[PDB]
Design a protein around this motif. Sequence first.
Motif, PDB file in Angstrom:
ATOM      1  N   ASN A  76       0.826  -1.191   0.000  1.00  0.00           N
ATOM      2  CA  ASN A  76       0.000   0.000   0.000  1.00  0.00           C
ATOM      3  C   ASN A  76       0.862   1.242   0.000  1.00  0.00           C
ATOM      4  OD1 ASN A  76      -2.165  -1.704   0.035  1.00  0.00           O
ATOM      5  ND2 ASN A  76      -2.546  -1.480   2.235  1.00  0.00           N
ATOM      6  N   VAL A  77       2.146   1.078   0.234  1.00  0.00           N
ATOM      7  CA  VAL A  77       3.095   2.141   0.031  1.00  0.00           C
ATOM      8  C   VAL A  77       4.179   1.630  -0.901  1.00  0.00           C
ATOM      9  CG1 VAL A  77       4.387   1.497   2.076  1.00  0.00           C
ATOM     10  CG2 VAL A  77       4.650   3.785   1.102  1.00  0.00           C
ATOM     11  N   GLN A  93       0.745   5.125  11.413  1.00  0.00           N
ATOM     12  CA  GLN A  93       0.016   6.074  10.589  1.00  0.00           C
ATOM     13  C   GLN A  93      -1.366   5.539  10.216  1.00  0.00           C
ATOM     14  OE1 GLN A  93       2.572   6.524   7.209  1.00  0.00           O
ATOM     15  NE2 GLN A  93       1.709   4.726   6.184  1.00  0.00           N
ATOM     16  N   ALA A  94      -2.130   6.370   9.508  1.00  0.00           N
ATOM     17  CA  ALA A  94      -3.515   6.012   9.222  1.00  0.00           C
ATOM     18  C   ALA A  94      -3.581   4.735   8.404  1.00  0.00           C
ATOM     19  CB  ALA A  94      -4.233   7.151   8.494  1.00  0.00           C
ATOM     20  N   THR A  95      -2.977   4.740   7.224  1.00  0.00           N
ATOM     21  CA  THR A  95      -3.054   3.576   6.365  1.00  0.00           C
ATOM     22  C   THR A  95      -2.164   2.467   6.905  1.00  0.00           C
ATOM     23  OG1 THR A  95      -2.899   2.797   4.099  1.00  0.00           O
ATOM     24  CG2 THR A  95      -1.163   4.239   4.901  1.00  0.00           C
ATOM     25  N   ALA A  96      -2.111   1.377   6.157  1.00  0.00           N
ATOM     26  CA  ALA A  96      -1.165   0.313   6.419  1.00  0.00           C
ATOM     27  C   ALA A  96      -0.302   0.140   5.187  1.00  0.00           C
ATOM     28  CB  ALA A  96      -1.860  -1.008   6.764  1.00  0.00           C
ATOM     29  N   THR A 107      -1.271  -5.327   3.541  1.00  0.00           N
ATOM     30  CA  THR A 107      -2.125  -6.220   4.316  1.00  0.00           C
ATOM     31  C   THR A 107      -1.697  -7.661   4.081  1.00  0.00           C
ATOM     32  OG1 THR A 107      -3.961  -4.675   4.110  1.00  0.00           O
ATOM     33  CG2 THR A 107      -4.462  -6.926   4.807  1.00  0.00           C
ATOM     34  N   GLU A 128      -3.124  -6.027   9.002  1.00  0.00           N
ATOM     35  CA  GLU A 128      -2.564  -4.951   8.208  1.00  0.00           C
ATOM     36  C   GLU A 128      -1.085  -4.783   8.524  1.00  0.00           C
ATOM     37  OE1 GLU A 128      -4.029  -3.663   5.800  1.00  0.00           O
ATOM     38  OE2 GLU A 128      -5.888  -4.736   6.246  1.00  0.00           O
ATOM     39  N   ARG A 174       1.063  -1.489   9.382  1.00  0.00           N
ATOM     40  CA  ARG A 174       1.074  -0.098   9.812  1.00  0.00           C
ATOM     41  C   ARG A 174       2.443   0.275  10.351  1.00  0.00           C
ATOM     42  NH1 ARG A 174      -3.466   2.403  10.046  1.00  0.00           N
ATOM     43  NH2 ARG A 174      -5.496   1.339   9.941  1.00  0.00           N
TER      44      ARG A 174
END
Lengths: 50, 250, 100, 50, 193, 160, 41, 41, 50, 50
Positions: free
Chosen positions: F4-5, F15-18, F21, H30, H32
Amino acid sequence: LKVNQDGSRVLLRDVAKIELGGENYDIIAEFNGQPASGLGIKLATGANAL
Amino acid sequence: KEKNNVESVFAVNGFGFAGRGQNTGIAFVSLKDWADRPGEENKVEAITMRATRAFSQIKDAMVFAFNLPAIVELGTATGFDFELIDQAGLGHEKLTQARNQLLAEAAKHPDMLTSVRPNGLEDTPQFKIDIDQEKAQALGVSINDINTTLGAAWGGSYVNDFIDRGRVKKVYVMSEAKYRMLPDDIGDWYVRAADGQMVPFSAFSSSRWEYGSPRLERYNGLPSMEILGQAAPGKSTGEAMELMEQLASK
Amino acid sequence: ATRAFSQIKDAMVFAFNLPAIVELGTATGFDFELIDQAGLGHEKLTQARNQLLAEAAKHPDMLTSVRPNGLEDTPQFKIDIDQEKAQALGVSINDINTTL
Amino acid sequence: VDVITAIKAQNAQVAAGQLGGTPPVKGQQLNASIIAQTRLTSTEEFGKIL
Amino acid sequence: GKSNVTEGALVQNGQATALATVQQLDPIYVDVTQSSNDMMRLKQELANGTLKQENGKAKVSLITSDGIKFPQDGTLEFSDVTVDQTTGSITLRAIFPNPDHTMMPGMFVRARLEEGLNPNAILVPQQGVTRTPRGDATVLVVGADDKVETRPIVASQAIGDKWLVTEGLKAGDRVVISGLQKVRPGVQVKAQE
Amino acid sequence: GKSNVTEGALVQNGQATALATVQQLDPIYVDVTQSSNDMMRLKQELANGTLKQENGKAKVSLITSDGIKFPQDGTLEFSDVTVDQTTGSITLRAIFPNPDHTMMPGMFVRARLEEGLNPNAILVPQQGVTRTPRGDATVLVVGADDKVETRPIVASQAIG
Amino acid sequence: PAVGVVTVKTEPLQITTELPGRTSAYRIAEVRPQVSGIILK
Amino acid sequence: PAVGVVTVKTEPLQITTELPGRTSAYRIAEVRPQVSGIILK
Amino acid sequence: GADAKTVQDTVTQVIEQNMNGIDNLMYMSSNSDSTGTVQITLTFESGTDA
Amino acid sequence: QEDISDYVAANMKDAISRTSGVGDVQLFGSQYAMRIWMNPNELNKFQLTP
């Protein structure tokens, strides 16, 4: 009616019942006191009714 | 009572000449073959007159048996079709009032006439209900939803069509009677807020009784009250019509 | 022509020249109707109709050229929308239908 | 438009239904006609068109 | 309840989404949406008067979606008087025992909540109730003279098939209900009840 | 899953996102959604029947989106007490085995729950069932003497 | 002319507020971590 | 009058709810970052 | 774009249920098709006014 | 009487209506039309509207 992102199903019937019925319940006929439904029958202007 | 002359009945509740509705109904009779209804007593006029008389001891009804006319296209009955009118704009009331002014006076002439009635309806008590949309908007429910939330739960409403056994019929949504029978359930109905909050209908709503005529009528483009009845037994109708016209003057 | 076209594949074809009148017939074929009174449904009729033809066709000494005027069923492309999915997706039906 | 929809909104016929209309409950004996929003009869009312 | 997070998923302190949802179902609360204007008359009436109560607060009833009353009643805890802005509606929170696990957080089940229990109600069959003048209950009750005299009144809120009417009628009044044809005002009449 | 990054992109603590996953495959979760009164109906249905045996941890099966039913049933895990305010949702979870990873979580696949049902009272072939007037099933039914008398009935869930 | 009538008789009345009250859990208290960091088990 | 007849009795039926749903990992975790900065790789 | 079925139900029979009380009708024939097409023929006694 | 009510309107009236000499028919009865019965309190229970 709708669902959720999860899909939980909010249905038409998911609140109230449902059944057939007459368009209106306005009218009733009995025949000799026996439950009845009938037709008003008008001669079209001009015909021999016999 | 009339079994002897009566083959059968066909009766109607909810439907009947001079307006529909639950307060109104009508009967259809089959009598037996004249050859099986000997003498005049077993002939309709007295059959009416009898049934008409008996039905006098009915309660809460105007109940009139009648034979047909010769030309039955023009009327449901024998007897005479007369028109009260409002010419002067004297308004529904005087029309109503001065109508009874006749049926008052005419009731004193059973010698001439019998079973004289209006063919038309009286003012009923309508239930008026009043939105303040402000409160409604203030509560952030829109009015249509009300309007939806109203006509259908209280009136029911048509939607669209479906098919039953190869043919179309109608879709209905409505409140269960027990929930639409009273001004109480009114605000037992709710509305969801634009924020999702469910809204009692009574919140924004207010109501009162009014009157309305369940029906209105005119003649030649003027308000008119038809009146009906017969020339009493032994009386030709001209005598009766004429009599009316005299009473029509006062 | 009627004879020749017959040699073609795929084609209920015939040449014709119209009578003195459509209705007026000195001696031809007939116009008949199977009907659904009970709302039985088409498929019940076809199997009712094809029942008539199959029984009809057994009297060439009496019947001839007995034919349905119309058209047999055909494979269709039938989408069944899972509604919850869609609205689980937040898509609107009419747009779906519309877009269709 | 703000004016328009509003005009349409609050001047119109909102039809209702009946108290006691069909089908009723058995034990009913008070059915009539329900009266609710209607068109406006006067300018000043229209002003109150909101 | 469920787990807002599976194992391994990072979390922060006092973060936005709680992880799992504990709950206690033995007792339960039912918030009763009340029409703002309504409860007015309530105390408006309860001092009005009359109306009454059971002397205590508060016994709430229930009839659940089955069309049946919940296996037992429940206790109305209070009424928070704050008018809910977008419901414009007072709420009633009545704690209910749910040691069947039958009730569930949120329903929202029909709650019939007992009320003032009017000591004396004039209940006229809505048959005999004919308004006049406009919106004015006119009862046709005929006195000893048996000459029908319609005595204007105002039917109270509709109830059952009958009108409660706060005023204008008294006990022992024979309601002239039907016979709306044979009775014009003042006419003599023979009662049937 | 994806990243996701991507690389070099700044991150902030928790942070907000992960970033991405991770996910399993063996036991997957489907979220079984149930209607309020039904779950309640069934729990008072507990009063009659159920009867769930016994092994009161129920079977669950699936018709996968192809319309084909998932090869083997799955374990109905728990019973949530949760009412989604817009729903009535009784929604449960029955964890399901996914050896071939055909389950692919997040989908929308439905699912039926088989609860032990003692109430063996009644069934009936359709043919003896007269639909219309509908809302009322009536069957032609042998009278005591062989005089036929149909009788009103309730035909609701047609079993095959 | 006789008439159906019904004498007066009220005294008895019980009125109540009936409506779909909104039930809720007695105490929910979703579990919100007092701490940050990964979820071990 | 001779008809095919099936005498009715009690038949245990395990047919029950077939209801909707969505599926999820488990296993639905997830990643994070608990440490802030630039992703080097 | 429709099948004959769709056509038939939301149009054809729609019209049918309206078709009544018109003179010299011998019969009425109708065709719905997947072209999205309708033809409803009503056959009237000869000399009936066109 | 509803069972009879509807079979009439559908199977009969229109043809009765289309009949030669019939200028008007009037039903005594009603045609089935789906009656959905709305429980307000169960809506709010589900937070829903007609």
